[PDB]
Ligand binder design. Structure first.
Ligand SMILES: Nc1ncnc2c1ncn2[C@@H]1O[C@H](COP(=O)(O)OP(=O)(O)OP(=O)(O)O)[C@@H](O)[C@H]1O
Ligand SMILES: Nc1ncnc2c1ncn2[C@@H]1O[C@H](COP(=O)(O)OP(=O)(O)OP(=O)(O)O)[C@@H](O)[C@H]1O
Ligand SMILES: Nc1ncnc2c1ncn2[C@@H]1O[C@H](COP(=O)(O)OP(=O)(O)O)[C@@H](O)[C@H]1O
Ligand SMILES: [Mg+2]
Ligand SMILES: [Mg+2]
Ligand SMILES: [Mg+2]
Lengths: 90, 486, 467, 467
């Protein structure tokens, strides 16, 4: 279930990235003319959503690397089981 | 007089030549009192699993066939004793006066030898007794990562049978078999000390296969405990057997099979590992009235790794048992103790395993809590929640607090009914969440002191009458008048 | 001319026969276990001809106590079970023995449990809806009379409860014969079903065949064939409509995988036997209606580890006309039946068979639920308020729809304490048409949870202060 | 006759044929000679299997390079045995009992077989007595047990050996009894460093060091732990000494067992490990224990391959322990030393009946805050803390301060930083973390909590930072 969970997380992160990039562009437009504004309460929305888009990109990259490690490892483990059975039947 | 010869040996496995009339699963005597079991019978030789002290086995040694399959002594003398998978005492308290012997591989009761699970087996734990009720003859899997409180749940359940034992009535008494497979010796000693302190060794037997034991003993220990419990079950008694834990037995069986060079499967497990556990756990049954009405309730324990319930052995056992309590370390660390994941935990017997009053006050508790967890996740970042959602969230928070419970703190069934009544009938809605627990305890104490008739009615009749319910509502409101909410 | 046991390894037995007396494949042989505690007569099924007059066989009972060199007798035929109207009202094991009245059916006609499937030219596709009264089933996974229906799911998601629900709604008023095959499932469940059928007075029309999970792999392999042989007799000889329930068919495959390497077969992917699809094909293709002879079959299919990509359920999917796929995710939310509306399917859900209105409403429900699934991660992180107005409206509608697909079932009262309900198909279609238009958007979502039709919805809403 | 001959050599595994009636018993030590110049030596073989036909399979304690088929093998008649007594203290030994710092030393001592049974179950008594260390994280969350079993898990380079050195400093220095250190499959230069450090601290005279390190055949790396445990068991059972047993690293014992199992022709288990993984660990660990009236405090480093805590070796090790400190790569990356995972680590005596209600309450509050902080990492990674509720932001700041304050300037860390370590009394630790969980230091900057001791250190560091 590890690979399935990782793929679900990759899909979630991709959707979040798309939404945050759209919001960053909308904030760019609104600058020329809610609480997603970074440390504003504690322009700012544009920077916060650019940061969030970059963070989601990094998350997608890391999750994809983990997913590929898991995919390779599953192939290797499956082959190990198959060949172990074959050897024991040799 | 057939005498075989050890033609090879190693790692707790021997290969013996001769013995043409040996049976499959027969018990074999190797010199120096060593015991083995014949598993692989082929024309060339017999593959045998040594049941301890295999370092004494040697090529050329004479092997005698005992003419009997694996069997263990059984009888009431085993109560209060620690034994090994052969029924031999290991507590140093002398011999055990066996009533008779029982073969480990006797078939489970047939479909027509049973009756539906109908009697509660109270664990004393509100979460389990209200949302995943266990009946007599049920198999409830306790599954979770390490240190999630699985042994705590099982030992509390054993301890909660002390009052039933004191009743003296076989229809009420539950005799407990605790099977320790692959555990460190001091851990078994600590479980035994906890049982002794609570007065449970009066009605508990421990079958111990510590981690030092041969893989054969760890493989056999659940079956030995099952045979001991079955002797009582077929004699009209009610039995509770805990397997702590079946993962270690599966590992021991895998070791044995790989050493016998049987072909491996998933995670190198033998093909018949599911069959091992299913044959073990279907001997827990609720017998028909014609067979005496006895029962054996199974509490297998499964340890997962990284909360991965999709591993091979957890999947097998989940598919075998009548429900499971999933324990999670995230819930544990959050203060949800017992750390039962309500959404995925379930009892496949349901209200039949509860008294009428409990079924009345807890009929929809598990579904309500599942929906509450869903809503809490969904509304985590919502800023403007409607009235209905806010009410559901507040009710769910109070219910979660209500189900929290410390270790070694059993609640009698009537007290559990009153507590769940406080919860699900809306009497906690005016209490701050952080006070719910205290409120509950105080309220119960109050009812215990000046209104014990409510408890007595629930206990005698297994029901909450309309008059008793009205009285309880009145008492709750009067108590709330004076309760001090920090 | 008898054989003798040469090798014993768990449930697989090698038997040597005199040259010229090797039993045919799938023949039943008899061997004696004489040890008093375990004394019995093993039935062995011939699996392979190993050569040199040796046969590899699969024991039907546990081999504990069996001794090398003991006599093996060839019955000359395959495992055969009693057939006829007499099997109705009685409980049998995979070998045809009657459990509730031992010795019963000894004198009946007996049929071999190994049989070829119907000829292709005799096959007629079935397109006729079997209304259940369950909202989610009737709307999104409409069942087919005389067709093949499966309930897929991981462990403990409600396959058995839904099987019992379908026995309640379909078998109770059935005008034909019912066959229930318990394949490698819990003995307690079999006793419960037996008692429940006797209580409902449906037992007199039902033949029960049980091979439980505690039996050796051979019994779990052959019990489905035994039940199916009884059903085939009712289909082809008596010529009446037959209901066939199997719980759980995956066990068949699993049992076959448990003896594969002991039979000397190199394992396939994911530890399954190499013959997975072929053995499943034999069995499943026997489970079918033929022209003029109807078998409505309903199979519970266990999905190992909830992994729908697992080879067993993946291979099973091709054999079904309708699939109700149960989901752990839905279960954990408290939604019962835990049906995954997006993953489930039915071959008769198209405008031509079910009509334009039903098809349109079902497609709209699926579209809304798919969009809600797509939006769930965003709602989890950024919150609902960052959705567009239309997406917020769709999310509210989808939450109400997903809750309204849940239903209080007759078989679930043992768990909820609430009595069940039945919803007519026309009412279901109208209710979900109204829901997809937002006609109920003003009611609290908790009003839609575990109810029947629109009257139940109104009553629960008023109970919740809405209307 | 009575003398065998080498028939097969497959790396460090030797098959030896003996005359009929002279086959050595399992675990007997045999001797063969390699005469080729540079590699000339006496091989000690250990009988591991009886292969049949008067053949035995043995594990060589030394590399077999230069061994020739047919050379004579002599059976000592007994298993490997090591010197025991007070004299082993202050000296370094290899797995065979040879003294390295003084060759020939200890040949006249009493010699004990390295193989023996664990204590009888009736002699086992659970240990619940806190072994205060002065380390905040250990004392609060994973209190060590005197006479109990402690393990330090961790991946490569996360601080297992530095923490073992820390515990030697904190516990062994003031120890009134005997100490045994077992270097198992670890760096030889680390063994040299430990020898020299103990000499400098004057702890060596109380300490027996046994080393079978990385550049050894797998047989020696499998048996060195047993040899050190044999010395520890002598001290426990013959002198009534309180014994400290340090093992670095026990995973290396499991790994050597896996190598040997592969060499012995056994069928592999999952992840290629030996089928007897749990059995071997059980034998060794069950020997490592206290008994009624006789104390062994054991501390074991446990390597975690590829940072995979699910790996079978650490997974089977977990069950044998009373306290478990799990070092985390993620914690290490933050610069937090000791790099403990406060949520994954555990102690059997961290319960109110043993450590008292206040210690337990404070520990549970710390764990709850850290768990809540971990649950929020999904959001924080993307959006940061600015989107959380006020309660969650308060909790996140509290959790960051708590996680930093679990760090400590360790005694053994001076060598890496030049900063002397600190010792925090358990009472001050409880008070400080109570105040932290209550929000009494929410105004101080985060770095003030990093790598310090008690509350005076926090005050001084915060003042230095301006707060
Ligand atoms: N209801 C509870 N409330 C508080 N602490 C609890 C509760 N149940 C168990 N614990 C504690 O949690 C820890 C784990 O308990 P336990 O040993 O039963 O778990 P486990 O899952 O069986 O562990 P292991 O993997 O060591 O076998 C122990 O400290 C126990 O005291
Ligand atoms: N408390 C500490 N303070 C500062 N640096 C430390 C500390 N602990 C460890 N380190 C650094 O980390 C390095 C690795 O530590 P250590 O040798 O204890 O790790 P390990 O887990 O035993 O490693 P391995 O798996 O390589 O044996 C140390 O050499 C030192 O550089
Ligand atoms: N419709 C339902 N309503 C309420 N609870 C249910 C429903 N269906 C299943 N459950 C719960 O989930 C459990 C699993 O049901 P079951 O059908 O036995 O699982 P499986 O899918 O493995 O056959 C039941 O025992 C019951 O407690
Ligand atoms: Mg435990
Ligand atoms: Mg089921
Ligand atoms: Mg190190």
């Amino acid at each position: 279930a590890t690979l399935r969970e990782l793929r679900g997380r990759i899909r979630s992160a991709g959707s979040i990235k798309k939404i945050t990039k759209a919001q960053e562009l909308i904030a760019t437009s609104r600058i020329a003319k809610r609480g997603l504004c970074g440390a504003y309460n504690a322009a700012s929305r544009r920077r916060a959503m650019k940061s969030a888009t970059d963070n989601a990109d990094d998350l997608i990259k890391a999750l994809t690397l983990a997913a590929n490690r898991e995919r390779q490892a599953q192939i290797t483990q499956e082959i190990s089981e198959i060949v172990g059975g074959a050897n024991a039947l040799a | 007089e057939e005498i075989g010869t050890v033609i090879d040996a190693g790692d707790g496995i021997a290969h013996v030549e001769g013995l043409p009339s040996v049976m499959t699963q027969e018990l074999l005597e190797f010199p120096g009192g060593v015991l083995g079991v014949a598993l692989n019978l082929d024309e060339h030789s017999v593959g045998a699993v040594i049941l301890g002290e295999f370092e004494k086995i040697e090529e050329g040694q004479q092997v005698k066939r005992t003419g009997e399959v694996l069997s263990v002594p059984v009888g009431d003398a085993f109560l209060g004793r620690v034994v090994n998978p052969l029924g031999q005492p290991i507590d140093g308290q002398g011999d055990i006066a066996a009533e008779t012997r029982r073969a480990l591989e006797l078939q489970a009761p047939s479909v027509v030898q049973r009756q539906s699970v109908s009697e509660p087996l109270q664990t004393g734990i509100k979460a389990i007794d209200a949302m995943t009720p266990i009946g007599r003859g049920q198999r409830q899997l306790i599954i979770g990562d390490r240190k999630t409180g699985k042994t705590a749940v099982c030992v509390d359940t054993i301890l909660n049978q002390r009052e039933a034992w004191l009743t003296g009535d076989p229809k009420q008494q539950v005799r407990c078999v605790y099977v320790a497979i692959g555990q460190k010796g001091t851990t078994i000693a600590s479980v035994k000390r906890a049982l002794e302190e609570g007065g449970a060794m009066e009605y508990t037997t421990i079958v111990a296969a510590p981690a030092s034991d041969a893989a054969g003993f760890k493989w056999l220990a659940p079956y030995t405990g099952s045979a001991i419990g079955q002797h009582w079950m077929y004699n009209g008694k009610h039995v509770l057997i805990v397997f702590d834990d079946l993962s270690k037995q599966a590992d021991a069986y895998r070791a044995i099979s790989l050493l016998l060079r049987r072909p491996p499967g998933r995670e190198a497990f033998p093909g018949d590992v599911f069959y091992l556990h299913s044959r073990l756990l279907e001997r827990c049954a609720k017998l028909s009235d014609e067979l005496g009405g006895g029962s054996m309730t199974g509490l297998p324990i499964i340890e997962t790794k990284a909360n991965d319930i999709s591993a091979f052995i957890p999947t097998n056992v989940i598919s075998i048992t009548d429900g499971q309590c999933f324990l999670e370390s995230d819930l544990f660390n959050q203060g949800v103790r017992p750390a039962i994941n309500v959404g995925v935990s379930v009892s496949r017997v349901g209200g039949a395993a509860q008294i009428k009053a409990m079924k009345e006050v807890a009929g929809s508790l598990r579904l309500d809590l599942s929906q509450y967890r869903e809503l809490e996740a969904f509304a985590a970042f919502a800023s403007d929640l409607d009235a209905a959602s806010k009410a559901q969230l507040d009710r769910g928070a109070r219910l979660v607090e209500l189900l929290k419970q410390p270790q070694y703190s059993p609640l009698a069934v009537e007290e559990q009914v009153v507590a769940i009544f406080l919860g699900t009938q809306g009497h906690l809605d005016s209490v701050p969440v952080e006070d719910v627990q205290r409120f509950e305890s105080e309220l119960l104490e109050h009812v215990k002191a000046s209104h014990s008739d409510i408890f007595d009615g629930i206990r005698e009749t297994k029901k909450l009458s309309e008059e008793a319910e009205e009285k309880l509502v009145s008492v709750i409101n009067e108590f709330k008048k004076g309760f001090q909410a920090s | 001319t008898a054989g003798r046991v040469v090798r014993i390894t768990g449930p697989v037995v090698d038997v040597e026969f005199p040259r010229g007396s090797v039993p045919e494949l799938f023949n039943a042989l008899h061997a004696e276990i004489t040890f008093g505690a375990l004394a019995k007569t093993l039935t062995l099924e011939v699996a392979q001809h190993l050569g040199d007059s040796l046969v590899r066989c699969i024991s039907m009972q546990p081999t504990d106590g069996l001794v090398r060199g003991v006599e093996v007798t060839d019955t000359g035929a395959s495992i055969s079970v009693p057939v006829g109207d007499g099997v109705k009202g009685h409980v049998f094991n995979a070998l045809g023995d009657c459990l509730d009245d031992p010795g019963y059916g000894k004198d009946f006609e007996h049929w071999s449990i190994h049989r070829k499937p119907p000829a292709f030219s005799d096959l007629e596709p079935r397109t006729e809806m079997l209304e259940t009264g369950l909202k989610v089933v009737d709307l999104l996974t409409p069942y087919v009379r005389g067709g093949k229906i499966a309930l897929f799911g991981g462990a403990g998601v409600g396959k058995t409860v839904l099987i019992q629900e379908m026995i309640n709604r379909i078998a109770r008023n059935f005008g034909g014969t019912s066959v229930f095959a318990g394949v490698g499932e819990r003995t307690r469940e079999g006793n419960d079903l037996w008692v429940e059928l006797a209580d409902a007075n449906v037992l007199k029309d039902t033949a029960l065949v049980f091979g439980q999970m505690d039996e050796p792999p051979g019994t779990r392999m052959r019990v489905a064939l035994s039940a199916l042989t009884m059903a085939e007799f009712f289909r082809d000889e008596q010529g009446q409509d037959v209901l066939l329930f199997i719980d759980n068919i995956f066990r068949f495959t699993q049992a076959g995988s448990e003896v594969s390497t002991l039979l000397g077969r190199m394992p396939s992917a994911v530890g399954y036997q190499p013959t997975l699809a072929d053995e499943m094909g034999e069995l499943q293709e026997r489970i079918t209606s033929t022209r003029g002879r109807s078998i409505t079959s309903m199979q519970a299919v266990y999905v190992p580890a909830d992994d729908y990509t697992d080879p067993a359920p993946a291979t099973t999917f091709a054999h079904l006309d309708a699939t109700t796929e149960l989901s752990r995710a839905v279960f954990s939310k408290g939604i019962f039946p835990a049906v995954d509306p997006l993953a489930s399917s039915s071959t008769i859900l198209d405008p031509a068979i079910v009509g334009d209105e039903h098809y349109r409403v079902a497609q709209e429900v699926i579209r809304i639920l798919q969009r809600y699934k797509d939006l769930q991660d965003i709602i989890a992180i950024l919150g609902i308020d960052e959705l567009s107005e239309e997406d917020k409206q769709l999310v509210n509608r989808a939450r109400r729809i997903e809750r309204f697909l849940s239903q209080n079932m007759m078989a679930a009262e043992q768990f909820t304490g609430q009595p069940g309900s039945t919803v007519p198909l026309k009412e279901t279609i109208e209710a979900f048409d109204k829901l997809t238009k937002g006609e109920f958007d003003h009611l609290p979502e908790q009003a839609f949870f575990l109810i029947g039709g629109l009257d139940d919805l109104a009553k629960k809403a008023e109970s919740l202060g809405a209307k």
